[PDB]
Write a protein that binds this DNA or RNA. Structure first.
Ligand SMILES: [Mg+2]
Lengths: 87, 205, 156, 80, 82, 129
RNA sequence: UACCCGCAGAAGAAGCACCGGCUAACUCCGUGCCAGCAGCCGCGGUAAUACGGAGGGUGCAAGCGUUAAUCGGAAUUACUGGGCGUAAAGCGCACGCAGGCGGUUUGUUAAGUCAGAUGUGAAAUCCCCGGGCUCAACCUGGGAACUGCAUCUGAUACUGG
RNA sequence: UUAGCUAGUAGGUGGGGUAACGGCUCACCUAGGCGACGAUCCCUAGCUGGUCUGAGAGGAUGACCAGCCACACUGGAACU
């Protein structure tokens, strides 16, 4: 913290990354349904969370949670994702 | 961009007088003045620090009928000015055109003062001013133009001004139905139920 | 006239062979609107009961604070147990600018227009101890004129 | 009167050219420490007369060479 | 080269002109040379409508400036009114 | 080892207040006297007694008030590793002007409020409050 | 076109989000670790103020939400404004160059530094005081500011030479 | 976890060249030049007035307005 050390080396402010990189700084991105299925969550909760494996515009293959209760989703379907993790 | 719902329902929320009707019929003969509206309105909660600052600011807006963004513009203007900001803020509130018509008692309520300015029945320095949110400069006159001098809701409001305390900074006339903005008022020239040291701090988190 | 504000409602526990004895604790502060203020940390088996012990502590053991007209006289910082807290006088008509316990302790201190900032621990017990220590050793121009053997105008 | 500078004669090997380094002593824009900063210049001497390790006095001139636009005016304390 | 022309600086349907020394190859947003005054065609009463430094103008015509049409009109009509 | 006699001086003042001593002595300097002839004038010490022939020794008298001390704070602004040169407009106000800031300008050593009335800035040595 | 009069009727003109705490605002009923909810802590395993519906209420408003994206809060890289006995952190020590740093006193120098003065730092923008559009947004007058750099005249306490 | 880089390179003399000065070009000498105050190499990028945030310090940022720069199917070259 001596200023000579501060002269020889600047304060490296830490660089943070996105947790949602597949959108690549976009609000929403178009996607293609690849597999629609359910998934049991981790220990404190017990459900069958409806979820779909998605091929995106940029070739990314991601999973994205189906909100709500009940849907009409097929594979090979055009959807749109907004973000947000599921805990 | 106006509130149109039940007036005394807002009075029941804030619990105090908001002058929203003519006061001819007694206010407590129109509503339970100490029960908040709806189901869980009787039981008073241990109300928090955040709520009373909100309720104070929600009082002053609903005193003058001012929506949040336009009220925030008054906050930005008063913060730009000098001295006590809340005193600057109340001066901006007293600077409102539709306020002074109620303060001259030409309309029975502020909303009954606002419709006149809306329906263009006012002349300010001989000029019609449609904007209700117009800022009144000192030493100006606010005259009823002669199309709608003959409205019965004008002269009955003059008697309701006789019922109220006459303001000090307003050289008001009666036979011509005009007035004169003498000077700006003080914090002291208004009520004491509006805290300077709360509405400042609410917008200064 | 000594206005009173509770600060903390809290539930701590001792542990015995039978189990855990929950005990409710409370922090309060009193003040007269002049430069007299006093805090109080009470503790009992009951929420409306520990506050009265907290008040009764605070009604005693006060401190005399040299205020200015509606604010402080010079900026100063305050520490107690890793709770470094800076405070500062302000211009007239700006309110108290502080958070947590510091909003309460200055309002019963009768100031009206301050600037304040807490660094480090925002633990409401030790954060109000740091406010008091800074307000305690804040001294008048009149005293430092007498301390330095001068006048006000010999300081300005 | 003229906008002249001094500095340290670093090199004198190449003909009709000397390398002179100049200390500029400047504040850091953030930390505020005063730093010795070095500006070297290729200066056209005549005669190859400058001793190495010397304080010279220089002047900005018209462009002499590809890397050289500087000509000395005089020399103080030439010795070692 | 050096020009003195009218430069639209105002809202839609209500023009206002900064009559400045500018360049005859540059533009209205872009490069002027020196700001020598202004003009309002919606100059109302109780306000000036043309306040120009009419002596530095004479300095540049002495250097061989170029004067536009309204600029030659309004400098005349100022002197035909003042 | 010896990187400053000035920071030596102020700390010897600082540790002598808490030690409740009446006399703090040290070897003297030309700059040391030029500071010590301010704080008597500004009323933060009582006496300084510069003595010594082979080597001058400055001996101070600490000012105590109501039992406790007078020097509530004593700092160092321009340290030897980092110097401070502020203009006449950036002269500070120690404890909102109630304390004093020792500045050395080309007109010797004075306080900041005198230097503002002198209208010329310089090197801020220390803060005394 | 701006603006001015007629005309007619309350007429043609309000909606989103939210209510477990965080944070302003709760009941009822369906539901039973299912369906789900979810910024965080976390709710649902038959009595859920956290799910869904209803009622009521809160927040805004011609918009209201969500996502993206940046600073702030974050002193969480701590110049201002951090720490290293055990919470992350003093090299296993010693040597030592460059490096940074320097006792005391006198002159000299005036480099740094400070002061003054010129030049420039375009306009716009922002700030301040005005003006104009019925106000406001906006437009615009004047001012300050543009924290600099260059040059010249000093200054001599300190730091240098 | 990019440390060596450079042969018209670096300097000179002479000739040539351009509106202009100068490896600008050429010839002939000299071996210099550069770099740990980051050369070199790689990645990304039009730059500034400004904009956004921040109490400030700063941080991020360059649509719109400006000032400059660069480009015009691609790669080239001159012409006028
Ligand atoms: Mg004010």
């Amino acid at each position: 913290a001596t200023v000579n050390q501060l002269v020889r080396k600047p304060r490296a402010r830490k660089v943070a990354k996105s947790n949602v990189p597949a959108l690549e700084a976009c609000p929403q991105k178009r996607g293609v349904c690849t597999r629609v299925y359910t998934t049991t969550p981790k220990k404190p909760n017990s459900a069958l969370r409806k979820v779909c494996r998605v091929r995106l515009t940029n070739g990314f293959e991601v999973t994205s949670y189906i909100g709500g209760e009940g849907h009409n989703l097929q594979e090979h379907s055009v959807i749109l994702i907004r973000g947000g993790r599921v805990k | 961009a106006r509130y149109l719902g039940p007036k005394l329902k807002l009075s029941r929320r804030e619990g105090t007088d908001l002058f929203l009707k003519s006061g001819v019929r007694a206010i407590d003969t129109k509503c339970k003045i100490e029960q908040a509206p709806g189901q869980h309105g009787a039981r008073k909660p241990r109300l928090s620090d955040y709520g009373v600052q909100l309720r104070e600011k929600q009082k002053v807006r609903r005193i003058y009928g001012v929506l949040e963004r336009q009220f925030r513009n008054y906050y930005k203007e008063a913060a730009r000015l000098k001295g006590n900001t809340g005193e600057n803020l109340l001066a901006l509130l007293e600077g409102r055109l539709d306020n002074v018509v109620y303060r001259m008692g030409f309309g029975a309520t502020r909303a009954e003062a606002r419709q006149l300015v809306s329906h263009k029945a006012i002349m300010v320095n001989g000029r019609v001013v449609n904007i209700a949110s117009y800022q009144v400069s000192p030493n100006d006159v606010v005259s009823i133009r002669e199309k709608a001098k003959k409205q019965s809701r004008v002269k009955a409001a003059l008697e309701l001004a006789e019922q109220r305390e006459k303001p000090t900074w307003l050289e008001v006339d009666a036979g011509k139905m005009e007035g004169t903005f003498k000077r700006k008022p003080e914090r002291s020239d208004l009520s004491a139920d509006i805290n300077e040291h709360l509405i400042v701090e609410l917008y200064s988190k | 006239e000594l206005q009173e504000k509770l600060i903390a409602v809290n539930r701590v526990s001792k542990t015995v062979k039978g189990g855990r004895i929950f005990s409710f604790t409370a922090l309060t502060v009193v003040g007269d609107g002049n430069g007299r203020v006093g805090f109080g940390y009470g503790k009992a088996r009951e929420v409306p009961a520990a506050i009265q012990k907290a008040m009764e502590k605070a009604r005693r053991n006060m401190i005399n604070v040299a205020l200015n007209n509606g604010t402080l006289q010079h900026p100063v910082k305050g520490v107690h147990t890793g709770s470094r807290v800076f405070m500062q006088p302000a211009s007239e008509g700006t309110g108290i600018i502080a958070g947590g316990a510091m909003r309460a302790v200055l309002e019963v201190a009768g100031v009206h227009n301050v600037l304040a900032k807490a660094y480090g621990s925002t633990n409401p017990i030790n954060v109000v101890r740091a406010t008091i220590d800074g307000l305690e050793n804040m001294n008048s121009p009149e005293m430092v004129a007498a301390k330095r053997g001068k006048s006000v105008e010999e300081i300005l | 009167k003229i906008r002249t500078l001094q500095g340290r004669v670093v090199s004198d090997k190449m003909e009709k050219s000397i390398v002179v380094a100049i200390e500029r002593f400047v504040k850091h824009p953030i930390y505020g420490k005063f730093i010795k900063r070095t500006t070297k210049l290729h200066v056209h001497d005549e005669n190859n007369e400058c001793g190495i390790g010397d304080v010279v006095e220089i002047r900005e001139c018209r462009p002499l060479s590809k890397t050289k636009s500087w000509t000395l005016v005089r020399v103080v304390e030439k010795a070692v | 080269m050096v020009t003195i022309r009218l430069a639209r600086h105002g809202a839609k349907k209500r023009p206002f002109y900064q009559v400045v020394v500018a360049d005859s190859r540059n533009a209205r947003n872009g490069r002027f040379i020196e700001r020598v005054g202004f003009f309002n065609p919606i100059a109302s009463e109780k306000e000036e409508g043309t306040r120009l430094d009419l002596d530095r103008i004479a300095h540049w015509v002495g250097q061989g400036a170029t004067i536009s049409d309204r600029v030659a009109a309004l400098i005349k009509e100022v002197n035909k009114a003042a | 080892s010896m990187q400053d006699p000035i920071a030596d001086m102020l700390t010897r003042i600082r540790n002598g207040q808490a030690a409740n001593k009446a006399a703090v002595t040290m070897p003297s300097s030309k700059l040391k006297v030029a500071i010590a002839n301010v704080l008597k004038e500004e009323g933060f010490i009582e006496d300084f007694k510069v003595e010594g022939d082979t080597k001058p020794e400055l001996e101070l008298t600490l000012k105590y008030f109501q039992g406790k001390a007078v020097v509530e704070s004593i700092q160092r602004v321009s340290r030897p590793g980092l110097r401070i040169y502020k203009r006449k407009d950036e002269l500070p106000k120690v404890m909102a002007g109630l304390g004093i800031a020792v500045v050395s300008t080309s007109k010797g050593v004075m306080t900041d409020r005198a230097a503002r009335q002198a209208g010329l800035g310089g090197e801020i040595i220390c803060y005394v409050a």
